[PDB]
Nucleic acid binder design. Structure first.
Length: 282
DNA sequence: GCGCACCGAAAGGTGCGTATTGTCT
């Protein structure tokens, strides 16, 4: 699954909280700023604030006071539940790497869509810059503490133009290509998983799960999905036609805030829960 | 954006809207 969220000032705290190698940089732009490997939270927070730091002018001054300033674009990649289970409960580390690769390859294509504007004598040109500064953060649990392999790819609101100037990203091409990029993540992941010897079961939506784990077992580890379904059922709503407002209310209002927890103990719970659900990881 | 109004200063820049699968941000 792939979803996007345009990040603004009010979300700078949320974006900052996202922080082998669970936090990694990516993007020709990142390279341009000398960023590689693990993400430095300090540099990350300022970049979100629009600070190139190299003693350059702060960015996005042209932002209208009556408009929200944008700090970035979060692309959240989430693996099918069976995949999260095999990687986090069964303990197949290669699945983690498979996910990371699918994310990296998809972001390369999102980067090929990076654009910015330039106005010369009243004439505006849309330039495909092809470079992004991205902070990738891999996480493993859902808000209900179920295994949930997902990565928050925070594309900062910045890109360097052909004339060497840095400006806000015109996210149009990336945002509108969310469905397509989700399909790319899906394809790459499936390819990587098949290389590991897993068979996949598709269900006519483009989605898939590992063939040896059934739907009831999946649902047994999908508490958030259950909460969303109960919300619609309570409101007497048909999930097939719910408006956007209703969908957002069902997902947000039933969502618990991230808490604390003993990961070692949680893993043990997962394994015991899997046995109870009769899952055979092979 | 379906080009505007409004920001800063570069006869220049930005938000805005965009998005809509599920494992459920």
């Amino acid at each position: 699954m792939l979803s996007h969220m345009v990040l603004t000032r009010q979300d700078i705290g949320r974006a900052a909280s996202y922080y082998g190698d669970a936090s990694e940089w990516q993007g020709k732009g990142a390279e341009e700023l000398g960023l590689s490997g693990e993400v430095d939270s300090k540099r990350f927070r300022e970049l979100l604030a629009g600070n190139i730091g190299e003693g350059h002018r702060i960015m996005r001054s042209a932002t209208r006071q009556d408009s929200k300033e944008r700090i970035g674009l979060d692309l959240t990649f989430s693996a099918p539940k069976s995949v999260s289970l095999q990687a986090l409960v069964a303990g197949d580390a290669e699945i983690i790497k498979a996910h990371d690769r699918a994310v990296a390859r998809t972001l390369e294509q999102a980067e090929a869509r990076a654009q910015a504007r330039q106005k010369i004598q009243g004439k505006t040109r849309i330039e495909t810059t092809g470079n992004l500064v991205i902070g990738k953060f891999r996480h493993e649990t859902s808000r209900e503490r179920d295994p949930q392999l997902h990565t928050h790819a925070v594309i900062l609101n910045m890109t360097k133009r052909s004339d060497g100037q840095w400006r806000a990203l015109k996210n149009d091409e990336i945002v509108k290509a969310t469905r397509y990029l989700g399909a790319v993540y899906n394809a790459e992941l499936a390819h990587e998983l098949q290389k590991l010897g897993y068979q996949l079961r598709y269900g006519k939506d483009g989605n898939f799960d590992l063939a040896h784990i059934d739907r009831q077992q999946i649902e047994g580890f999908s508490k958030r999905t259950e909460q969303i379904a109960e919300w619609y059922a309570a409101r007497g709503l048909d999930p097939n036609s719910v408006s956007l407002e209703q969908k957002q209310a069902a997902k947000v209002l039933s969502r618990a805030k991230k808490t604390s927890v003993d990961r070692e103990a949680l893993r043990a719970e997962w394994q015991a829960t899997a046995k109870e659900l009769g899952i055979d990881f092979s």
